[PDB]
Every structure is written in C-alpha cells, then in structure tokens.
Amino acid sequence: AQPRETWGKKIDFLLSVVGFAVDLANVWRFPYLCYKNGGGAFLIPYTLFLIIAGMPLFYMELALGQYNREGAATVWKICPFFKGVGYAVILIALYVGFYYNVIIAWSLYYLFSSFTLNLPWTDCGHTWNSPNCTDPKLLNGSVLGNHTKYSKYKFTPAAEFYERGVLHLHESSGIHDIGLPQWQLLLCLMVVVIVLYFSLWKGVKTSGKVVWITATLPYFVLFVLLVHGVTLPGASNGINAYLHIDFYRLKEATVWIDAATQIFFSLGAGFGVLIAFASYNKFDNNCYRDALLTSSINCITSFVSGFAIFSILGYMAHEHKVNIEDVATEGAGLVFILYPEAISTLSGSTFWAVVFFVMLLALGLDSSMGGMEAVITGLADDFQVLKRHRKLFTFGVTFSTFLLALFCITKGGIYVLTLLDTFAAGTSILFAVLMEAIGVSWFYGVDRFSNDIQQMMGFRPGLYWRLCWKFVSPAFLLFVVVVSIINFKPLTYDDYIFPPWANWVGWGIALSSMVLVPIYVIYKFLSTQGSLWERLAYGITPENEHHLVAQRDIRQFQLQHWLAI
Template structure:
C-alpha cells in the first residue's frame, strides 16, 4: 500500500519540497496492495514487446538501414540504443513499477512536473486517432485478400484509371529516370490510392468528403477489438498479447523462408546489408538513427510507465528493460531480411535496381509488398498471412497507447477508476469519432498531418522534460535508492551518468534536429496549405502546453514567497 505523502513538506516556512522533492519522505511501495497486477510475468513482457514492436519495425527501419549505409547504419543505431534508448526504457519501467501509478500521478515524486504526464497522455490519445486507421487499412486488405485472384493484380477494375499499366509492361526502359516505387499507375498503387483511399476524389485537405463505409466498418471492428481487449484491464489485455505479440514473429519467419527462395532475393539482401562507411560522414544518418531508436522503443508515450505500474514491487525491471529493448531492435533488423528478399525479387522481375523498388511507409506494405505477393503461387495465402501480421503488429501497439490513456487518467480521477469499463468504451468511441476524418476521401491528408505534428516534436519535448524531471529535480540518487528498495541493488555508475547527462543531451539533440529538419508538410506531390501547417503546430502545442501551464498553476497554488519557492 502506498504511504501518503504529507500535503506540505516544510523547510522553515518553505513549501519548496512539496513540488520539487515531495517524495523524499515517501516510503518504498509495499508489494501488497489493492492495485491490479499482471497475471503472469510473461503477460507483461509480451505486452511491452508488442507495444514496442510495431508497424515501423517493418516499414521504416529496413529502408533507413538500406538508405543510410546498410550495415554501417547499425553503428549509430546501436550507439544510441546503448547510451539513450535502453537508459530511457529502464528509467520508465522503474518509475512506473516503484510508484505504481500512471503517467500523470507518477509525478507525485515531483508535482511541478505533472503537466508532462498530461502531455504524454494527450499525445497517446492523438496517436490513437490515426494509428487505428492504419490497422483498419490492414483489415480491409485482409478481407480483400480472401479471393481467388487478388484485386490489385491487374487493371480493368472499377477503380482503375485509363492510365493503369500492368506490372509486366513496366521495366527499366519504361521508367526512364524514375523509380518503380514512385510509379503510381500500377494496379497495386491504384488499388491503394483509388480503390481503398479514394484519394482521387479529393482535391486536398480542404476537400475531405464523407467517411467511406467500407473503411468505417473496418474501423468499427478495430475499435471493438481494442475495447474488449482492454475493458478488464491487464487481466484481459495480458492474454490478448499471447496472440498479437507472437504472431508477427511466426509470420516474419514464414515470409523470410518464402522470400529467400525467390529469384533475385539474394541481391535484395546484399543491398540491405551493403556496408558504406562513408555515409557516416552525413549528419542526416545520425539524425535518422537517433529518431528511429527513440520512436522504435516507444519511451515517452506513457505506455511503459502504465504497463510497469502493474508489476509486482520487487520485479527485476532492469532485466526486463535489457531484454525487451534488445528484442525490439533485433526484430527491426530481422524484418529487413524478409522485406528486402522480396524487394530483390521485384527488382529482378522488372529489370530495375533494388533502389528503384525500395521505399518506406505505407507505400512499402500496401503497394510494393502486396504486388510482389500477388505474383507468387498461392498468392491468396501469402496475402492473408502478411496482412494478419500487419494487423497484429498494429493492434498490440494501439492497445498500449490506449492503456496509457486509461491508466493515466483513472489513476488521477478515482471516479473514472470506479467506472473503468465505461471510461474504456468512451475512450475507444472517442478515438473512433475523430478517426472518421481519416477514412474520408481526403483522410490520408488528415492522417499525415496528425502523424507529423501530434507525435513528432511534441513527444520528443515531453520525454526530454520527463528525463530532466527525474534526473535533475527528483534526483538520480533518490531514484537509484528507489530501485534499490525494489530489487536490492543500485543502478551502476553508467546508468546514473546516462540518466543525468547523456540521455537528456541525446533528447535535446533529437528535439533540435527534428525542429531544424522539419519543413512544410507534403504527401507525395501534394503540398499542404499554410493554414494546415499552422493547424498542425496547434495540435502539437495543445499537448506541450500542459507542461508550463501546470507548472505555473502549481507554482501559484503553493503558499509562500517567490524566494521561498525558488531557492
């Protein structure tokens, strides 16, 4: 049971320790208490791995590795993993486990920073608005795959344009100076943009249209899956991840075995692993490695804090941090073999270079890879297997984000905790309503805007403030003592140095790099209007402003003079 912290901790008449060091009198949380815990340790591990291993592991890391020097990219990637990724991962797991609170109330350790808890909760909510839509796309493709001939194999469908060109008529000479990945008149490309998104019926973000009924139904299914996975807390979600967290590994292995049997697959793998140390002279490579390791591990979204808050008090979260962060990064690297074996096959089939078919994001998993699958014997089976993998990759990551919102707010507002099932439904239904904007004809523009601004600079800013709050205000020494109370040993000097100096410096570097490299928003050849970028920054600021506003509120709500508060 958590012991209550005195409402005012005074030094003379000073209330300083109330909101900077109020946890100095807090005792170690007892392993007993009324807080729900994971049914089994494996439930927690699979939930963390399932959250961290998401679609980006498949559609972003392999391409970044290929683009940034192949094997050479692993040098900055591994460096940032060791000096920042793992320390931040460890910090969040320990923070949640010791205090047994969600992302907001965990800041009883240093109340002036509670605003950052609300920041990450709001960001997790924003991400759910559009991430669920990507899962709905996967579900749509899964349903569409259940046919004898895949609908994106040939032209002459109702959604195809007059310019649609069958893949067998496209080769290096036809492309000229272009690349196959950008050749948007193949059946697979037109199925994605015209058959699924209906992008051709929108003139831009100012012309959204009504929600598409088929995508809306898929979105309804996704939201119901999320609700019934989360409505009973970790007792229910901890069982769902047995499927959603393990299925992608089975499918990736199966796809890899099939991929390496295809002609040209070895050329694709060679291109993926090709080592070019000269690329390390480019600052962009280091920025890509830093941002990828940060987003890949998922620190700062409040999910790790929420998940670990349901651990038993003496759980070895140090070992968990090392294990799960390593599994996540190895998965990213491994997925590249499954992806590039197929890209090598595509390159040989069309007599082009691997770089002409290599791409990232939705274009890879909804256009290039499905097109390759459509040419294989038993294509229906391979398509179903692939989209089941995408579906499970997305579901458990979305579950993690929604759990961060639910845990964070139910811990803060007891009325919500008493009505968790109703609040879970309200949260799921709320994300569904906003997500409807993303399943309109111009929905991809809304999704792109949210992806850029809702979880871009804002989440980097949030976790930077979080790291500063823990390391510099609550104090590394006090935090280390908390860990010793849980596990019987203090973190080594390396971890303490990372928390206090290296990780904040890393985050500051990523924040600055993200800001400086952020230009006007674009989707392919479409440039967003100026007002859309202003709206995007408004979305970003709506979460970030919780940090200063709550600090100001706390500052003025605590009695005492300015000198007494600030000394």
C-alpha cells in the same frame, strides 16, 4: 479502494512491452533507413544510440512505474510541477492512436480483400479498384524498362487499389476539401475499435492473452516469410544490398539523426505505455533485465524484418528486371504497394496475403492497445472516479478515438493523418520526453532514483546508468528536439503542397501541448499558499515529504543535489 491490479504472469508483461516496442516502423522504416544510410554502416551509430536511447530511459520508466505503481500522469508525486507533463503525453498517445487506428483499418480492408482467387491488386478492369483509365496497364508486363521510380509510378494495379480502391484519394484535393468519411473504412474502424474495447474493457486480464496472440503471430509470420524468401531468385542481391557496409556515409551527419529518430519512435522510450505496464508488476521485479530483453528483442525483430522485406524486394526487382534501389521505399505506401505485387507474383497468393495482412493487423492492434491502455491507466490514476468505472471510461475513449479516426478516414484523410503524425508525435513527444528526463534526472535527482531501484532490486545501478540518466539522455533529447525544430519543412505529400494554415494548425496543437505543460506548472505555482520560496519548495519537492518543506530542509535548494554524480 480496491488494490492495484497485477499481471497474471510476468510473461504477459514481457509480451506486452515487446508488442508495444515492435511496430510497423520496424517493418517499413528501419529497412529503408538502414539500406539508405550505407547499409551496415547505419547500424554502427544506430545501436550505439539505441544503447543509450534504449537502456537507461526505458529502464528508468519501468523502474519509475515499479516505484510509483500509477499511471503516466500521477507518476509525478515526487515533482508535481511536471505532473502536467504526464497529462501531455496521455493526450499525445491519444492523438497518435487516432491516426494509428486509421492504419489498422487499412490492413483490415486488405484482409477483407485477401479472400479471393483473383486479388484486386493483380490485374486491372474495375477489379475492386477504381480505374483511373490513364493507362492502367500491367505493372511491367509489356516493356522491360522501368524509367521512373517504381513507388512514384501511380498507375500500377497495387497503387490504384491503394489510393483509389480503399482510400479514394481521387475524390479529394487536399485538407481544404476532405469530404465525408467512407463507409467501408467506417465498418473496418468499427471492427477495430470493438476489438480494442473488448480487449481493454477488463483490466489487464484479457489484454494479456490478446498481446500473447498478437506477439506469437507476427514472429511466426516473419519466420515463414523469410524462409520462403531465401529460396526466391534475386533475393540474395537485395539481402546483400541491405547488409552492404559502406562506412563512408557516417560523417554525412544524416545517418545519426535518422537512426536516433527511428530508435526513439520504435522503442517507445518516454511514452506512458511503459509506466502504465510497469504499474502492474511486482515491487521486486527486475526492470533492468526486462528493459534489456525488450530492447534486444526489438532490435532483432527490426533486423529480421529488414532481411525479409529486402529479400522480397530483391525477388520483385529480379521479376521486374530493375535495381534494388528502384523498388526500395518506406512506409504504408511501400508495404501496401510492393508486398501485394510480390505476393501475387508468388504461388498461393491467398495464403501469403492473408498472413501478411493478419501480421500487420496484429501489430497495429497491439500497438494501439498499449497506447490506449496507457491513456486509460493515466486518466484513471489521475481521477479515482474513472478508476472505479473502467468499462464506461474505456467505451468513451474508444468512441472519441472512433469519431476522430472517422474524421481522419475521409477522402482526403491521408493529409490529416500525415499532419497529425508528423507534428503531434514528433514535437509533442519530444518535448514531453525532454521534460520527463529533466524532471526525473535533475529536479528529482539521479541518486534518489538509484536508491529507489536499490530498494526495489538488490543491486544498485552503476555509474554509467546514472551518468546516462543525468547527462547523456537529456542532451540527446535536446539535440533531437533542436534538430526537429530547425529542420522543419512545410508539409508536402507525394505531389501535393500543403497550404500554410495546415502547418499552423499542427504547430498550434504542438504549442497547445507545450503550453499546457507550462499551464499546469503555473496552475501549481499559483494554487499554493506561501511566498516565492515556499511555493517553489512545495512545487519541486515530493508530496509525502512536504512536511520537511515547513522544516526548512529542502534538498533541491542546496547545490549538492545538483552535482550528485
């Protein structure tokens, strides 16, 4: 029974949680969601939502970890009925990791496509990009007017290299005929998973330095990019369009849901990564300051990434003689299409391409590292046999992720990636964070967690924190869940409609998770010896307090536990 591991320094934990919080969603989703939702008028609700969805929950997780010093699965020693919930989130993270690795591979491919004087996305002619031959001309070299949407036009050299050069989507038609995995993407995925294994194979020692590097790099990259972009012609128009405050859209009821989803999927609240990272800190560490600093750093990073991206977009629109809304897009398509074009247009395309691709690689690597570390920590604290042998279990996890990401990098693997991401991430992690909030706030109690924090840190959390823990956060999570359930639309690509069975498979994965949580609750209720009341007491009370279950002193049965605010 070796003692629990600890970080070398708290700066390592801070950089780890920052790298987990900072993601490509801050780069490709926050700017577009901000500009589309009235610019600055998007921020006024966003930060507000951010505040709640950032301050208690994150804090809670950290505090929870600092009080439990265990993984996301075994953290439910105060309420075993929700322990399976942790299991779910682990699988959830695992699921995410799969397609996330795919994204990383893409960046790595572009990295291997960045060492040349004539980049593939510059011109046409089978220059490392499969020529569709259906008018693969220069982007807008001949004519002045871009009639259709720039992102919708699929005959630009950047888009041709994206969907044909690396993805090879032309060789597939959908999820019914996906084909075989590509070999160069296979090698890129091999390199990615090998780096991840060599980073996470030995506790939290080397991973600290790795997240140090992958945190120090992207901020410098963004700084250099914005410094070079503010001097570019036309970037001022893009920046002004990004910060244009139009308070009219706030009542549209769509600027709130988008901001809530963006904050929830960017900050990482409710995920096992936070508990896993907090399970290695000191017992007297201040989780409040750490959570606040992480949220502030995440928001500032999102804002500066939006500034830089929209400066680049304004420069490109000036070069393309079009409006900012035409070039405005979001996602992997957005980056991999528009950024290489502006880089090739700028002087020294090699340096900018290399630095942008290495920033994306570092971000993806640190995010997948945090997710896989959470998975490993949870499954190790759950089964002590896995905690002893960490290298072999890490190798097995990396190999399973590699096999499933190979399944997902096929000719039609973008459809499987979208399906997994949308269905699994949204539904599963929403239900998981809702169950976790309900368990920690109501079933366990909001005063016991405050007393635990008072034991860890000298000051006791105020009334606002408890009220947001018990009422505001659960209601917000339930609202987001109901919105995601009602607003569900059939899966659709750019121009490809998904057959009905793909949506049913996605909902089947989501239902697998949200019955495995009840499957575990039923297993716990049945595997206990006693009557209805005694089984319920053993299920809703902490294990270390199970003795008072026999003493007829259950606090949850009384009503003072429920109304403790």
